[PDB]
Structures are given as C-alpha cells and as structure tokens.
Design a protein around this ligand. Sequence first.
Ligand SMILES: [Zn+2]
Ligand SMILES: [Zn+2]
Lengths: 397, 397, 397, 397, 200
Amino acid sequence: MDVLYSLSKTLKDARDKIVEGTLYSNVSDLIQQFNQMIITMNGNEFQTGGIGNLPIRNWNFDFGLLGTTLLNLDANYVETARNTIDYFVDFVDNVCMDEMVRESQRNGIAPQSDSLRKLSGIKFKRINFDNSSEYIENWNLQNRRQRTGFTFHKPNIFPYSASFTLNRSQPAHDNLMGTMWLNAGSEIQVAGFDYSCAINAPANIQQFEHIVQLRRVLTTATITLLPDAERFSFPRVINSADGATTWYFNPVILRPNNVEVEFLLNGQIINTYQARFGTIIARNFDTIRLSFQLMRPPNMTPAVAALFPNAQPFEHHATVGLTLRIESAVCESVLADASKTMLANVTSVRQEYAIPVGPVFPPGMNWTDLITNYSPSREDNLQRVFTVASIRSMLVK
Amino acid sequence: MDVLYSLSKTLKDARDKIVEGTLYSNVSDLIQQFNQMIITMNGNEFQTGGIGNLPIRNWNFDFGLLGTTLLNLDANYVETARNTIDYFVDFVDNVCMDEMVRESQRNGIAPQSDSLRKLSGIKFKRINFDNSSEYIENWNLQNRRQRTGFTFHKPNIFPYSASFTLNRSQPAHDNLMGTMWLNAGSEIQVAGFDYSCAINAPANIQQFEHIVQLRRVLTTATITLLPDAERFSFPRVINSADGATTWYFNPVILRPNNVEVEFLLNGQIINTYQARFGTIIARNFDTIRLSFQLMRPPNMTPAVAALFPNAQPFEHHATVGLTLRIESAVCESVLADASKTMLANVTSVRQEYAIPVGPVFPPGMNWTDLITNYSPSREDNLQRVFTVASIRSMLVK
Amino acid sequence: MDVLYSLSKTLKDARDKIVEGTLYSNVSDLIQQFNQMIITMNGNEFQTGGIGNLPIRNWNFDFGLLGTTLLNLDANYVETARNTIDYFVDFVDNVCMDEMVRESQRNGIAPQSDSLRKLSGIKFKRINFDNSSEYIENWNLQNRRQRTGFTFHKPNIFPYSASFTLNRSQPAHDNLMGTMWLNAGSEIQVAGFDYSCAINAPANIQQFEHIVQLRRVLTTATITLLPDAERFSFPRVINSADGATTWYFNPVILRPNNVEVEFLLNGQIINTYQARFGTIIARNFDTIRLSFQLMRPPNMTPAVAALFPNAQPFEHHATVGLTLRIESAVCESVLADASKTMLANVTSVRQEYAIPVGPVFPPGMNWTDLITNYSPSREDNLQRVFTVASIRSMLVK
Amino acid sequence: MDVLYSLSKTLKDARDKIVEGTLYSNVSDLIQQFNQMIITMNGNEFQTGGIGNLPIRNWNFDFGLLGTTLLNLDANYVETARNTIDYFVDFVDNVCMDEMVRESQRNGIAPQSDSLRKLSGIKFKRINFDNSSEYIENWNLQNRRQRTGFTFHKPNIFPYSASFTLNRSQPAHDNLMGTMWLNAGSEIQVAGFDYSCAINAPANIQQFEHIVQLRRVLTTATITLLPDAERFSFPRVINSADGATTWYFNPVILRPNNVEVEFLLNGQIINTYQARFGTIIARNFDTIRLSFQLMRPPNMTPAVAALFPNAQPFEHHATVGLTLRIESAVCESVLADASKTMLANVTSVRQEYAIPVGPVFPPGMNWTDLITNYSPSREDNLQRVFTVASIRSMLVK
Amino acid sequence: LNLYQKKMKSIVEDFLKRLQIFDISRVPDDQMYRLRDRLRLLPVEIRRLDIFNLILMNMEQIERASDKIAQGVIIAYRDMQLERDEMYGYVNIARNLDGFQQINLEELMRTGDYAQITNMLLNNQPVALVGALPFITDSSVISLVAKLDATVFAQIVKLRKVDTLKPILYKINSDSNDFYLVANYDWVPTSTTKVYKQIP
Ligand SMILES: [Zn+2]
Ligand SMILES: [Zn+2]
C-alpha cells in the first residue's frame, strides 16, 4: 500500500519539477528516486479490472532510464520523459479504481485486487518516499498503533434524522407539547413547543431536552450555537405519530430560557455552556445534550396576552429553539465533511463502473446508512478506500 | 508565463529557507537555482503600468551573486540577501498587477503586458522550476491539451436568480399555484404552492418541478438535500408578474411528496434520488431537476381541516419545498467558491487602481453577470487572471 | 496517434509510387522510410477487436527488407513487395476500426484500444512523416494549441427543427399570426403569416423575426439568401400547439418587406444585410437573425382586394418568407457536411459490427442529437474518430 | 509573385514533413530549399499594413540555418525550428492581407504593396518551386498566354435577378400572359403563365421563352434540367410593373410542352435538347435559351374543364415552367462557386480590417454587382486577390 | 561542460589504474563502456559536486577577465564612433551584443561552413561572431584611417578554418602613440568595428 503512495508523489513531484529549462541540481535527488522505480518494475507484469463494467487491462514494463548527464534541460528531454509518465498515470488510475471497488468483511483493511496484493510484495518496497500527504501520514501512524487524527470543515457526523416526539398529545392534536428536530451533517436544530404556553406548568416553565449521540468522538470542535430554530418557526401540517392523520403547528417564538449545552464523553460532562450563544469550543465529546425551557412571559402587553388564553382553543403555539453547527473538528476516524472529495470520489468511481453492491458498504455508499451503522469493518474499508482516493487525486482530478 | 511562476516559488522558498543560522547544505540545491536567475536577468530593462491609476515604475538589473561557501549562515549573509529580494518582490507585484488588468477578445488566453510578453521569450526559459502550486499545475496540463480540474468548497455555479412562476393565477391573486425560488452560489431553494391545497386536483396531488441548468459541468459533487424551503415559509407581499400590483402569500408547510432529484448530463440521467434527504453524491452533471408534489392530506384533524375549505377564500396557502446545497465539487473550468480568494484578488486590484471596464469582463467583475454569460473568452481570461492571482498570493497577501 | 497516420501515407505513397518500371531514384527517399518501419515493428505483437461483433485478431511481425540494389524495377520486385503491403493494409483496417468504436467521457481525446495505446509508445515514434493530409494537419496544430480550421460544402450546423409559433391564435384557428420554419443542415426556411393581412396593424405592417443559434461559430461563410419560403407556400393542415386539433393554412405569398439579416457573434452584429438577395458573405458568427415584415398592399386590383376583406372569415392567408443556405464555411470544430464521408464512415463501421451504444455518442451517432448537445467530450471524441476515419480512407474506401 | 507562392508550400511541406521522428533523408531535398530561403532573406527589412484598420508592423530577419542531426529528428530539433516558422507564418499572413486589399484600375494585375513589389525583384526568384497548387498552376499558364481553366461546383455565374414580363396585361390584371423568373448563382427557374389558358391562341398553344446571357463562357457543364418551376407554383400578390398597384397570381401547373433548351456560343447553337429532363451536358456556351409552351388540354375531365371557362373571370391561371441547375462547369475566369472560400476570404479580410471602398470592386465585394459588370480590371484584380487567398489558405484557415 | 569528446575510455583508464588491482588492456570493450554506463547514474559526493557548482558560476567572469582573448567581434560597415574608457583610453570596445545575429564559431568550425556567413559578408551585412578569440592591439592612429579592421576577415573563406582570425583593437592613448596628429585637428574616430572583451 504505502508503495502505491510513492508511485504518485513520484509522478506529481515529477510532472511538476521537470520542465523545459531548470537546472539538473534541483532534481538530482529526484531523478534518482525515479529511475530506481523503472528498474524494480521492468520485467513484472500486471492485471487490473474484471469486475462489473470495469475493463480488464494488462500492463508490461520495459523502459529506458534517464539522462543523468546535462547541466540544464532541453525541451527534447521533457517530451521523451512525459511520454513515459503518461503510461504510468493511465496506469495508476486503473490501479486505484480497481482497488477502490472491492470490499471485504473478514479483513476489510488489507489489499484486495490482484494488482495491489502484488505490490505489498517485498521486492517493491524499494520505492517508498516523502509521505507528507496528510492521509498516508495517518495511514502509517495507525499501523504502528498510535494516535492518528484528521481535519474537517463542517464534518458529516449526524445521520439525517428529522422527527418529533409528542410528550403531551390527544386525538385532536389541539394541545400538544414536545420537540421536533433535524440532525444532519454537522448541524442540529431543535424546537420545544407547548400549545398551552405553560399555563398549568410548575413555575409556568416547560422543560425541554434534546440528546444527540455521535457515532465517533469529535475533538477540537469549533461550534456556533444560536438561539431559535428557524426551521421550526413556521406553520406546518404534520403527519401524526401513527400516520393516521395530520396535526397543525402554528408557532410563535420566545427566547429559550435557561439554555444549557453539555458535551459529554462516556457520560461525563467535558464542556458545559449556560446560555452562551456565538462561538464555543467542545474539546472532546461523543454526545451533545441541549436543555432549554419555555417560560410563560410573566408580563404581557395586550397583543401578547391575546395569544395565550387561560382556556383552549390554543391557536398560537409557544415555541423555543436552538441551532448548533460544528464548523470544524478533528476525528480519529475518517468521515465525510463539506470540503473533502473522498466520499464523492469513491462513490463516483463505483457508480460510473456499475460496481455491484458488496458485503460491506450500504447501497450507493449512502452516507446516512454508513454513519448510522459505522461498524469497524465499514471504517477500515472506508479508510482504505479514502486513502486510495486521496492518492489518486494527486494526479487525477 | 510558467516563467513568472518560478520567479515566486523562487522567492518564497527563499524568504523562507534563508534564515540566520540554517545549515548551507539545505539550500545548496536552492542557492544555485537562484543565482541562475540573476544572470539571465541582468542586462534587461522592464516597464510596468501606464493604465488608469496604475503608476509606471521602471526597472533595471545589475546584481552580484552569493557566496556558496560557509557551513552555517551568519546574520550578515541574510541582510545582504534580503535587500536583493525586496527589489524583486516589489517588482513581481508590479508585474502581476500590470498583466492582471488587461483583457483581449482575441487571445484572452495569451500574455498581454509589455512586461510579460518579454518573459515568454526563449532566453528566459532557463529559469523554470518546481511547478507544484495547484494552479500552475493545471495551467500546464491544459496548455498541452489535456484533462484539467480544480477543487471548491461551496462553489459559485448559480448566477443569482430569485423569482416565481404562477401556473394558475387571476387578477385578485387569491387562488394561485406555482413555484418561487432562489438560486445563488452553490444553493437552490424552491417552493411549490397551491392556494387550493389540491382540492380539485387529480388524486388531490399537485405536481411541481424546478430545473436549473449549470453553465459548466460539475463532477464529484457532495450535496446536502433537505425537505422544506425556509426562505419561502413565511408571509410575503410580492409584486405581480407585470409589476402592476402586489399579492399576498401566507404559507403553511407540508412535507414534499414523491421527491425526485435528477442530476443530468446532456439530457441523460446520471444520478437520481427518490426522497433521499441528507448527503448525496452527484458524480457528473450539467443540470439539476427537482420534482416534488403537494398532496392534500387525506386525513385531517379539525385544526388542519379548518385551514383547507372546499370553497374560497383560501387563506392558508399549502406549500411544499426543497433545499439543495453543493458543499464541494470539481470543475474543469475556474469558478469562484466560498474559500478561494482569486476572484476577490483580481476584483480588488482592478478596483484599487481604477482600472477602466474592458471588452471582456462585466463591469466590476460582477460574478452573476460573468457566470450567466460565461463565454470561452471570459473563461480563458479568467483562468489567466486567476492563475496570476494565485502566483501573487504565494508572496503577497 | 500521429504514428498511425504515417503507416498509411507510407502505404499509399507506396502502393502508388512502386510499380513495374520506374527508376529507383524516384523512390530512394521513400524506400528508406519504409524499411525503417518494418524494423521498428518486427518482434512486436498486437491485438485488435474483442468488442461487440468485432472479430479478435492477433498479428506478428517478421519481414525481410527491400532490395536497395537494383536500378529499375522488375515485375518480380513488385509482387514480392505487394505481398508484404497487403498484410499491413488488412492490418491497419482492423486497427482503425478497433479504435473507431470506443468512446470515453473523462479522456475522450486520447487513444483507447490496446492496439493504439501501444503505438503512442516512444519506441515507435521513429516513423512519423509527410503530414499534409488536411485532417492530421489540424490534429497537430490543436495539440500545440493553435488556430485550427476545416473546409465544408453545405455544412451540417443546424439540428433538424421543424415547427411554428402562433403569436395570435384562438380556438377556431381562423385568424392566426406567427411563424413556421425548417432549420436543417445548412439551410433555414422561415415564413411569417398573418391571416388578417395586417388590417388592424400599425402602419398595416406585421413584423416577423427568426433567430437561429449555432452550436459552433462558422467563419468565412458563403451564403445564398432568397426571398420566399417555398416549403411554406402551400396549403396545409397542421396540428395545434397542444396536439388537440388541426388548423388550416392557406397561404398567398407577398414579398418580404424590410428584410434584414444579421450575423452576430456573442451578441454583436458582425455582418448585416438589408434586403440583399443572392450571394452574401458572413465572416464570423454564432447566430443568425432574420427580420422581415408583411406589409398590407396599399393599392390592390379587384382580384387582390377580394382576398383581403375588412372582416373575417379570412380565407387567404398573407405570407412572407426567406430562404438562407450556407454553401460553404470554415469551422474550428469538426462537423458533418454534404461532401465528407467521415460521419458516414464512423457510423457505418459501428453499425456493421453491432457496436453497443456507449457513454459519449447518441444512439446511432444521430447527427441531430449530436449537434444539439455538442459537448466538449463529444467533440473531442468526434475529432479523434473523424481523424481516424480519414486515415483509413487513404487506403480503404 | 510566384515567389510568394513558394514561401508557403515551403512552410506547409515544412510544418508537415518536419516532425518528431522522421528519418532525415525524407527531408534532405527539402531542408536545402528551406535554408536557401533564410539566406536570400536575412538583411532586407519590410513594411506591411498602413491602410484602414490594418496595423503597420515591421519585420526584420536574423536567423540561423538548419542543423542535420542524423537518423530521425529529436524533439529538440523541431522546437528550435517551429520557433522560426511561426515568425514567417505571422509574416506571410500580414503580407497576403496587405496585398489583398489594394486595387488598381490601370494595372490591377500586378503587385501593389510595398511588401510584394519588393519580392518580384530579381534577387529573390531563387526560391520558386513545386507549383502544383491549382491556382498558381493557372497563374503561370496565363503569364505565357495559354489555355487556363478552373473547376467549380454550383458555379456562381448568374447575378441575382428576380422579375417578370407581362406580354398581355390590362389595368385590372385579370387576364395576364407572360413570364416570371429567378436567375441566381448556378440556377434558373422560369414560368410562363397565360390566364386565358390559350383559349383564343393559335393551335391553343402559347409560346414562352427565357434567355440568359452569361458574363463569361462556361465549358464542360453538367446540368440538371427539370420540368416545372416550384418557386412560381404558388399563389402570389405581386407589385405591378409601374409599382402603382398589386396583381394576383393563382397558378395551376401543366407540363411544359415542346421544351427546347439551347446552349449558344456567340449566337451559334452548340448544344440543343428537346424535352430532355434529367442530366444533360453543355460543352461550351455563353447563353442559355429556354423555349417552352403552354398547350390548352384538348381533353378535360369536368374538374379540369371547370378551371378553364370560355369567358372571364379567369380564376385559375395556367402555368408551365422549367428549372435548370449547373452542377459543375469549367470557366477560364475566376468565379465564386458553392465550395471555394476565395470570395469569402477576400471579403472577410476586407470587412474585418475596415478596408475603405476602392476604385475597382463594388462596395462589400458584392457578388451580384461584381458579376453584372465583370470588367477586365475587376477580373484581373479578382484573380490576383483569389490567388493570394488560396496561398494564404495553405497555412491559415 | 559540453565536452562532447573524451568521456568514454579516457577517465575509465586512469580510474582502474589507480585501483591497482588490475591491468586494464585485457578489459573487453563491452566492459569499459558498460562501466561508464553505470557510473554516470550516481549522485556526487557533496564535496566534489559542491565545488563544480562554484566554478561554473564564475566561469564566465574569468574568461572575459583575461588580458589576452575576448569573446567575438562585430562588423557593421557603418562608420562608427569609437568609444572611450579610462583604462584603455580611446578604444573600440562593445560591452554588449544585441541587434546583430550571433554565429557560434564553435558550431561553424566544428561542422563545416555553408557560407551563410560567406553571403552575409559578401553582400556586406551586419553580423557578429561569438566565442573566445585571438587578439591584437595597435597604436597606429593611421591604421584606423586605413580601415585595417575591415580586412582580416576576407581570409576565413579561402582556408576553411577560422583559427587565423586575429581581430583588431586600437589602444589609442593620448600618449604612447607617436601617431598623435589627431587631437591637433578637429575630428572624431571612425572605427568600422569593435570587440566584446568586457572591462577588467
Ligand atoms: Zn462554508
Ligand atoms: Zn451542392
């Protein structure tokens, strides 16, 4: 595997540092590495493809070295080189793709394809070099069993979930109390509603709570917390819990009272914030708990008083809410986020070549399904597959 | 051109690796490259500026070189060097800016300025070196007529468009049916409304559809699709299509029924998703088609039934919607996005120096106007201009 | 690729300049080139076919050189040569065909087949020669990214489109006003009709306009423009816009008034002609706009007056029209035209070998579909495929 | 002049036969010719442009000859060559264009531009070679005085002419007899009409005749002759001869009787065809005479009899016609046709550079005006200008 | 160092010899060359390498720094104004080519002549010659008047060579030149030619 990596940084730092002009001395250290490769390869034979709509292609090697002679580089030098690179590019592409499709339950971590299995061979190890590409960097550290870690912008930790829970309801759905939410990606919006505006509630306050359990721990998270859930601030006609009928939600929004956000790790409070809106840091957590209340306004102007009668019908439904967004965070496990193309690359190659559903990944590499049941096997396969996608993107985008 | 590039990575890898103390043998390979330059330059005269409020500064070359000698670097060594760098910096800045304003209908892809035209000369090619900066990387691969590609978080593919289409309307605007939307940047929000709540519609279902045609194909797109269009979930007073009067929109939101998103390429469905909210992948498309329906609730509690009478006046307007956001994608053409400063750099330099409107770009480099009529000439000029902005940002931010 | 080219001009200039008689001296320069080939080939092994109904064939090389001895040429010399040529002919045919079927989205420009991919190899480049064949000529100039260009007689730029637009209509379709047209290939015919003969129109003149947007710019176009649209000068029964009924068109033709043809490029008028019929030149345009009017005759003999009453029924329908034909033009992109057999060759080879529909080209290489959505990928594939067809036609027709 | 020619075939056979990989000996004979040029040139300086919007650029020569690195060229060899070619290309373009705009009444058959006048100088003749380009081929043969000759597809010999001649008419235009036609390009359509259907005509037959005089003799013409003039087979409202009113034409078509086509040369019948439709050959003619008759049907079914009463009003107008198209022909004088781009090239260069109207050519190089008054001066200038356009198209399209 | 000559054996021979162990000669030819083939593909002990990089950077400077030999000459068949420099006094030096073709003597000589130069000289055209070259100083005020500098050249063609191409300079100082009936008459130096030796 690491082998694979090199193959690319070789080509990149190649198709990059080798051009009509420059001095030999700037590539001397490079040129070498290169040749070294050609050698190890030549003589060997390969095979890629064979699954689904993926073409089968065989490759052989028999190439000349490089003129370690000149003081500068003449156009002619390049072209005779670029011609050799292009065969490797078109190669690697086919190599990546071929191993970017196969999955495996037992050992979903190690190589699969006839192409790569052959590379992990010892006789090729004579090629590793410059592993500064964030992903491979972490691939190694994990082999040696040590503390890994990646960086994500608007990570994708929450499987899509949009629902409600009626804590007080009745057939007519004319005096409900409960919460409704949307957990998706890196965002959570939750609203607590009480049709009665806490008219008969102790201290005229109704307590609400929303708990979200992450499938993986996030550390170093920069988070935006804002009062109100705009998504649940407008009139709605919703299906009843049993699907037998529809209820009416006509919200009027009040400020959430006694807001408390807790970021817990294994049941322990790691970070807690009381009514702090804006930017907050959650340094290590696997669970978020949002507690907030609706407090009936003790003093009301006529217009307000008119919305909240002492007796039904309750026509304006008191609602309080919160919005929480994880802007960035670090995770020890690979995840999809709003910036990296890994998930999209893997999903795209599989879709383009009509790769059949396998035993590990959900149909279509569906993110929600994947993160909902993020088993060790899915994670090992995902990491292998994401690391390969990242190796491929160094040359082919 | 590529020439230009070097000039910088030269200086950066210079103003960076040349510090009081470091061991020589870390820069041996570097030092060289440097000198090589000075030589090729010395004996040449340049001129930049001359347009709008851009000064016309003149430059000459005549410099000594650098001892190669010394195990480690002594402070004195640096300062005598930094003094030489600063003249090149202040130079390049003026060089970039001068070629970052001129546009040419004809060959808007070729060099313009007297300054650069002179660089593409052969006698200067002896300076090229280390082309790994994502942009130049793609500049080459294109000049050779090959497959390019870039990376964008929240790309800016949709020209601003905020409007509506009334499929059923009448003078009083008291029983409308149609859609309203906002396409902007990487996001689309669209709502379908039916004042009658499909009371007389076949199967009590009203079909809606929203089609958006991209000006450039996006591949590898990671997309968030969510039900509801919050932007169109509140009461509005809107101007009529003819601008003669104003209508009232008083939405009540229902879940979009039979949601189907199609990502098409040249009329062909490449990806299709049925009612799948959350994160989805669209691997290659030039068009997005969102189809969704409003289905009159077959069972209604009294509160709901009251909103939807059998006869007018229709006072609560049934609305269903969708929100789609392209988090990341790859495009073969340069585009503005939410992270890169290229567009802002080009636009800013032109604004600061009062550069007159030219024949290629819309006034103020207006993004909406640019992407709406993204001609080949505008794209070639944009790419040239974006690549220069990226070369400049390696040294001057 | 260029490699391929040679292979042929080699054979042509061979099966042509080598015959029972002539002097050595006329081929000396040639003979050489030839041998040079045999060498480079011998030892190598190939494979063509394997897709659809295309036979798989393997080829090996082990041939003797040529007697560079003799003065004149004796019959015997030829026959021993022709025998060697025939193996190459039957070869190339199979090579062309094999690469004339495969398509590819990502890189639809470069080679596909195992046969050709091997040719682009460096070790064969030792064969290029005499690239005066118009197509290869342009293939190169495009690699070096420069101004290309082809020549066409009755080009095929307009996708088939035959329709109408009723600007004034009513259920009975007894007093219509609008236009009907046929855009196909290199021709446009458009008619403007007004059942009322502009009886209530300002200045008794009805304005018409027909705009056609080319998918590619045409330069240097020689065009025939004639008044009248014969195709729309006869009685017709046509389907209504909604397909629910049929209307009657009973034209009577008048000369088009204030004819103005504009050939625009990116919205700018490049050429404009006012009422000029016959041969006109449009030097560079991507759009054609034809504007013409129907002017009610101010003076009418009884027979004419009788056709145009002050009140309905309107039984004779005043019609004015134009016919425009692009006889020849130059395009920077390959196109089908009325003389070249490229499209037909590619389409024919695919049909004969039952080649399955691929990811790039429309089913059956349908021209209208192709030109309607002439994407960059379709054009690159079309050019590759057209260039190969042209290489093949040098030997096999 | 001939000089000029070479300059190109030099470059073409150059930018063509000189590629990465061809054996030296395939260009030995060529290389030479090339160098020979450089020599003769270097030293002398030139001026192009200096008219309308045409730029005045100054060209100077200072080039090193061509090496000969043995055994097939190395990439490097090419690039150092291509760099030299590109200066000549960009040169010739400017040379052609500069002499492609100047006209002269007195001697408008010789070189005008300061650029070319200098080339006809003796010290340059040393370059001329391979005069196989059809146009130059004929340029020479004319300088010596001999049988020239060009080849055209759908030649453009007929100036646009669309009119009628009423042989019998009256104010009401209710009983007309005459002909109407369209002569344009290579086609003629003519119809003979008799509102009375020869009711009072001798032998119930009305004779018609249409004569067209070519401005230049056409030889070897392949012609399509078909009965009927579709263009004049539909109802029309036409302006009267004096423009004071409009008449009604309501044709009903009968087969033309006793059709006789004569192709005359200086008043002598060279070819004559009696009622022969399809493909006919006219080997040498300057005039075409079409004679045809309308013969009242001696036997008529009721439906037919009803169209042709013994007394006015005559409501169905008996019409007979012919269509003649010159598919191909040879002319001793240059002409525009449906395949060659010469006229379009000359017209386009003049339009692009805003070249002022001169003393020889009609405004806009209008074809109809040109061929209508095709004076010796216009022809000599046209030939010079067409020959230059053809030299230019060998390199720049 | 573009020494497209020795490279093969030359170095190899010395190499082996110093190794002592074996007596070259009986080293099959496929051996000695193959030995190079392998040698040429290795780094270079920083020491070694580090120095060459240094020599090359100053190479140019040395060459023009010498007292004998300058780089090429120019011919313009245009009465030209002699320049003046504190050190040489009144001389015809040019510190820069630019405006006249360049002809790599080395290239010409090594590859035979096609007279490209022969024609340019004959129809008398502005041209330059580049590389290292012989040299001649002269004090004969008169000389200049006699236009000697435009002579030497014709030569080359007859001999097909160009070694015998000593060009001329006029170290005309207001002194050591017995020939000074010059500043006594209103006048200005008309040198038809000058040279590249940059100033020390
Ligand atoms: Zn963002
Ligand atoms: Zn035709």
